[PDB]
Design a protein. Structure first.
Length: 230
């Protein structure tokens, strides 16, 4: 038995990974899914997780500061691209995203759907990219902010906003939107999922699955759910 605390966005990928691992090695991978905030606080308080996958470096930093992970095992496991999506029925085809992108033409008179950049992580990263590309002056008054990424997708899914900014895994999970662009990684803080072994849990079975998470079979599952691997 190996116990993994994983950010909830990883639920389906980790469930598939657990299936592959149990069939090939005959070890049960038991996962607990919640927000990175919830999981880090449980681990800090002494929860018996073996592995922790956070959806950001901030909550892994937290766990490390409290001496709850083994820092020698900490490593970025996954990334997520920042993508521009369009309604499936839109005339919009894929385009090149850079400093020259004519956002006003692409908006066709409407608004850009984003997570509220005051608190939604995808909206924070969207605003960073647009500001660094020099497009924020244009797009700031033309936003359609939502309370979360789901609400931002819903605008684009329902063809109610012509464009939206989400993560690559968000785009893959949403059948009703299509990717029309990818932000340069240099344009914003990298979206990263670090993996680490929990303090006191670095044994053979835990290390074995720890290593498997970086191997080909797991990388293929992560890739098809829209994450980037390392």
């Amino acid at each position: 038995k190996v116990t993994v605390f994983a950010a909830a966005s990883l639920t389906n990928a980790m469930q598939d990974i657990a299936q592959a691992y149990k069939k090939e090695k005959n070890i049960e991978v038991v996962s607990s899914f919640a927000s990175s905030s919830t999981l880090a606080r449980q681990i800090e308080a002494g929860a018996p997780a073996d592995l922790f996958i956070s959806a950001d470096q901030k909550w892994m930093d937290y766990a490390a500061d409290k001496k709850a992970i083994d820092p020698a095992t900490r490593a970025t496991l996954l990334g997520n691209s920042l993508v521009v999506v369009a309604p499936k029925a839109s005339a919009q085809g894929a385009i090149t995203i850079d400093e020259k992108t004519d956002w006003t033409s692409l908006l066709k008179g409407g608004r850009l759907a984003v997570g509220d950049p005051q608190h939604v992580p995808a909206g924070i990263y969207a605003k960073e990219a647009l500001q660094k590309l020099g497009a924020w002056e244009t797009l700031s008054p033309k936003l359609a902010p939502a309370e979360d990424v789901r609400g931002a997708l819903a605008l684009v899914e329902r063809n109610e906003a012509p464009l939206g900014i989400v993560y690559g895994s968000d785009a893959v999970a949403s059948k009703g939107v299509k990717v029309v662009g990818t932000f340069p990684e240099a344009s914003h803080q990298k979206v990263e999922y670090p993996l680490a072994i929990v303090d006191g849990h670095r044994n053979a079975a835990v290390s074995a699955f720890y290593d498997y998470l970086k191997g080909p079979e797991a990388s293929a599952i992560f890739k098809r759910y829209g994450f980037t691997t390392r």
